Write a structure and sequence with these properties.
The complex is a heterotetramer, with two copies of chain A (7 residues) and two copies of chain B (64 residues). Chain A has one strand at 3-4. With 7 residues, chain A is mainly β. In chain B, 33% of the residues lie in helices and 38% in strands. Chain B has one helix spanning 43-63, and strands spanning 2-13, 16-23, 32-35. Chain B has a single domain (1-64), classed as OB fold (Dihydrolipoamide Acetyltransferase, E2P), CATH 2.40.50.40. Classes of the chains: A mainly beta (7), B alpha+beta (64). Chains in contact: A-B, B-C, C-D. Strand 1 of chain C pairs antiparallel with strand 1 (3-4) of chain D. Chains A, D: The modification N6-acetyllysine is found at residue 6. Chains A, D: It is found in: Nucleus; Chromosome. Chains A, D: The modification N6,N6,N6-trimethyllysine is found at residues 1, 6.
């Protein structure tokens, strides 16, 4: 899965 | 942390890189700029974006 | 997976991005090119490298 | 820690 943290 | 659908842009803010994130399940209206430090878990999508930029840079070169 | 000391370069191979990795505890002789897909866990160092490239691109612009 | 996979 491609994920990221949201700022 | 959210699932990312695509990376759409890149910029520098105060000299530090950020990328424009399309979040999976959210409309484009909610796209956000994120520090490159935040996107370690979607480097396949980041690589896809980088590949596209290079392709366009090569085109700008060709037309020059 | 190894500890990374620094990112030293960037290139495209068959249109896909790679970065040049200095491994912590290894001499520069053993630097390797790695797919951007491989470096999700050292994005602080990747961001540092990107910041430096931008700085040099701005210099090339200034001198033009 | 900053780490990466080695190919």
């Amino acid at each position: 899965k491609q994920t990221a943290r949201k700022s | 942390e959210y699932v990312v659908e695509k990376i759409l842009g890149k910029r520098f803010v105060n000299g530090r890189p950020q990328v424009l994130v399309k979040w999976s399940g959210f409309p484009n209206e909610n796209n956000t700029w994120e520090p490159l430090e935040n996107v370690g878990n979607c480097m396949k999508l980041v690589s896809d974006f980088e590949s596209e930029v290079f392709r366009l840079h090569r085109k700008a070169a060709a037309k020059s």
